[PDB]
Amino acid sequence: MEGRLLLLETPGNTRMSLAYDEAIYRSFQYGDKPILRFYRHDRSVIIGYFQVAEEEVDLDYMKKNGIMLARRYTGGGAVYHDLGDLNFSVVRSSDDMDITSMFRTMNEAVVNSLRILGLDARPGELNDVSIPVNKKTDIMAGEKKIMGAAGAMRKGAKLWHAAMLVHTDLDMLSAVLKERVANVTDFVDVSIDEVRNALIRGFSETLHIDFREDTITEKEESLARELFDKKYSTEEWNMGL
Numbered sequence: 001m002e003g004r005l006l007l008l009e010t011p012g013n014t015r016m017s018l019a020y021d022e023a024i025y026r027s028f029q030y031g032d033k034p035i036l037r038f039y040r041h042d043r044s045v046i047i048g049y050f051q052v053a054e055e056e057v058d059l060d061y062m063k064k065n066g067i068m069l070a071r072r073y074t075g076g077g078a079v080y081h082d083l084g085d086l087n088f089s090v091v092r093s094s095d096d097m098d099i100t101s102m103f104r105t106m107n108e109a110v111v112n113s114l115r116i117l118g119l120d121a122r123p124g125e126l127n128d129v130s131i132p133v134n135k136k137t138d139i140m141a142g143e144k145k146i147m148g149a150a151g152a153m154r155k156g157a158k159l160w161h162a163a164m165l166v167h168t169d170l171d172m173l174s175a176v177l178k179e180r181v182a183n184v185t186d187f188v189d190v191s192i193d194e195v196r197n198a199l200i201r202g203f204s205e206t207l208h209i210d211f212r213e214d215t216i217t218e219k220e221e222s223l224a225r226e227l228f229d230k231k232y233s234t235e236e237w238n239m240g241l
């Protein structure tokens with residue numbers, strides 16, 4: 001089956017990037033071409049939809065250091081991104097609300113992709129959502145987390161997007177979200193492009209979809225702009241004013 005590969009990234013505006021990402025999710029109609037989107041964000045902390053900013057991050061350190069706060073539309077915990085972090089989102093038709101199985105199948109895809117790069121990894125073991133590593137939504141290179149993910153479902157559509165640490169500043173990560181995380185490049189000598197290419201092939205093989213490069217539609221673009229103008233660009237959305 002043919003998919004859409006969207007190489008669609010606004011690294012200098014994380015809030016707009018997130019607007020793009022709900023936009024593609026919400027524009028999706030059951031039976032549409034499944035979407036695989038790759039993107040990076042400059043220095044940024046992205047918190048879960050339901051999180052209290054000042055409980056989860058050092059907002060004073062962040063402002064002092066020019067790190068953008070951005071709230072995403074999926075739940076889950078807070079993460080630090082920079083240009084060393086590769087993000088990706090998968091939107092597909094859905095006939096059920098079995099989110100566990102979604103994470104399971106996307107993690108298989110990620111594991112297959114990393115195998116291509118010579119890196120052995122598994123999904124974490126634990127259900128406890130509050131713990132920092134080894135969750136079933138994490139991907140673990142042994143004891144170290146190298147990737148986390150969040151997702152959402154509605155009638156007819158699912159979304160699952162993930163942040164992979166390729167060559168992220170792990171010291172900035174630890175400072176802003178206040179030994180357990182690692183970069184992919186701590187294990188194998190690879191570029192972001194090589195990682196992206198492995199993920200394309202791995203997701204294609206695992207999901208049996210051929211993701212061909214495409215652009216966003218006028219409808220997807222206009223919704224993203226609306227979501228940004230009315231929501232993602234605002235302090236109320238991000239800070240929860």
Ligand SMILES: O=C(O)CCCC[C@@H]1CCSS1
Nearest residue numbers: 046076148149150161162163
């Ligand atoms: O590590 C976690 O537990 C949450 C991962 C959230 C991934 C999002 C991908 C696009 S924005 S941040």
